[PDB]
Ligand binder design. Structure first.
Ligand SMILES: Nc1nc2c(ncn2[C@@H]2O[C@H](COP(=O)(O)OP(=O)(O)O)[C@@H](O)[C@H]2O)c(=O)[nH]1
Ligand SMILES: [Mg+2]
Ligand SMILES: [Zn+2]
Length: 396
């Protein structure tokens, strides 16, 4: 198919223009769509078709060239991940780096550099090793030539030594759509579709689950991101942790098997789906089991080829600096503390039952399906709001 091939994360300090840039690239000026956004992770996908004008040779995301008017040729479909707040974004990168193939760091030319949030976003990208970065120097029309060049130097200084050191800095105006063609061109040159092994065991992280049968039948539907291999109609799949049940007054989870009846990607039904963008998986599952996002956070794969399920985790801990109302200093993790953990699209509270050298043991409220070595975002309830304090690496 012509489904999205890569997911591009939109990062940068609040108000610098991430959302406006996303809309400028996706062509959305109306409308909501936030009804397909994640619940465990407030993540949203917005596709755009990258095309090139045979005539003037400039890139754009319209079937009609904005510069000469001619019809453009299809090059590749991509998906942009844009989230509401700083926290949700940071958590998304640390919990699911496998969801991003590259990133566009938005930096507003009229703001003093660098800002706390921008610093934390780069830190997250540094931690997950995401180096396919493009920098968008936004709101360029709001500063004179001198300010503009000076801001550029600060950015170059700012990115030196980081995973963004080799990133191009592109002066643009997201709001007025200025110099956007250069940015689209950069997406093609700096965020190439990775060479994935379509033969690795399939793995999909479930974002949302529904019962699409109108009020007043088709099986349950799972919406998510394929991070490995591929899915095909007719495929038999296993879902973990699975369906919850009660045994001796306690909750347990039963992995469940089903079959793929349909696949929606890129805005249409297909026979095979791959990594990139959101994928809708129609199954033979009883809608009663997927209704109301009951399977959000679960992992999909082929029977006998899924990561293990954990009731508790031994985590190698790496606490964050954190510079973004005072309370910057992250206090050490104490036994008995209740933390909020995000791993992949799964989310669960955890009770610290043991402490070790740069390590904690945590009993989970809800089991999670993950592989040893996977990254887990750790949040602490500060007053009355969960705050990201670091991440852990699952150990055996
Ligand atoms: N003048 C100007 N304003 C812009 C530009 N891009 C975005 N904005 C505005 O600045 C504000 C913050 O933008 P928003 O897209 O919500 O960015 P976000 O907070 O990073 O996700 C909005 O009022 C936008 O209309 C630009 O190129 N020029
Ligand atoms: Mg925004
Ligand atoms: Zn053209």
């Amino acid at each position: 198919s012509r489904q999205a091939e890569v997911n591009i994360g939109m990062v940068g300090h609040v108000d610098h223009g991430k959302t406006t840039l996303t809309k400028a690239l996706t062509g959305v000026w109306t409308d909501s769509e936030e009804l397909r956004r994640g619940i465990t992770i407030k993540i949203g996908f917005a596709d755009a078709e990258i095309r090139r004008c045979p005539n003037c040779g400039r890139y754009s995301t319209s079937p009609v060239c904005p510069y000469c008017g001619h019809e453009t040729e299809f090059v590749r479909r991509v998906s942009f991940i844009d989230a509401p707040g700083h926290e949700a974004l940071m958590t998304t990168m640390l919990a699911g780096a496998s969801l991003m193939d590259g990133a566009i760091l938005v930096i507003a030319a009229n703001e003093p550099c660098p800002r706390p949030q921008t610093r934390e976003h780069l830190m997250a990208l540094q931690i997950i090793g995401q180096k396919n970065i493009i920098i968008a120097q936004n709101k360029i029309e709001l500063v004179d030539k001198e300010k503009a060049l000076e801001n550029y130097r600060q950015i170059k200084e700012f990115i030196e030594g980081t995973v963004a050191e080799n990133a191009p800095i592109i002066p643009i105006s997201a709001l007025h759509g200025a110099n956007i063609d250069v940015l689209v061109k950069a997406i093609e040159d700096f965020i190439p579709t990775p060479k994935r092994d379509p033969n690795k065991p399939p793995k999909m992280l479930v974002l949302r689950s529904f019962d699409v049968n109108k009020p007043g039948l088709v099986g349950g539907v799972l919406d998510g991101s394929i991070v490995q291999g591929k899915l095909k109609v007719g495929d038999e799949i296993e879902i973990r942790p699975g369906v919850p049940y009660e045994e001796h007054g306690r909750i347990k989870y039963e992995p469940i098997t089903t079959e793929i009846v349909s696949l929606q990607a890129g805005g249409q039904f297909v026979e095979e789906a791959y990594p990139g963008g959101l994928v809708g998986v129609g199954t033979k599952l009883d809608p009663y089991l997927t209704k109301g996002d009951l399977m959000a956070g679960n992992v999909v794969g082929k029977p006998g080829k899924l990561p293990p399920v954990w009731d508790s985790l031994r985590l190698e801990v790496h606490l964050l600096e954190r510079v973004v109302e005072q309370e910057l200093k992250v206090e050490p993790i104490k036994r008995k503390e209740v933390l909020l953990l995000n791993v992949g699209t799964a989310r669960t509270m955890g009770l610290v039952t043991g402490l070790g050298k740069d390590e904690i043991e945590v009993k989970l409220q809800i089991p999670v399906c993950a592989e040893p070595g996977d990254r887990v975002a750790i949040s602490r309830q500060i007053g009355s709001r969960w705050r990201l304090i670091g991440y852990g690496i699952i150990k055996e």
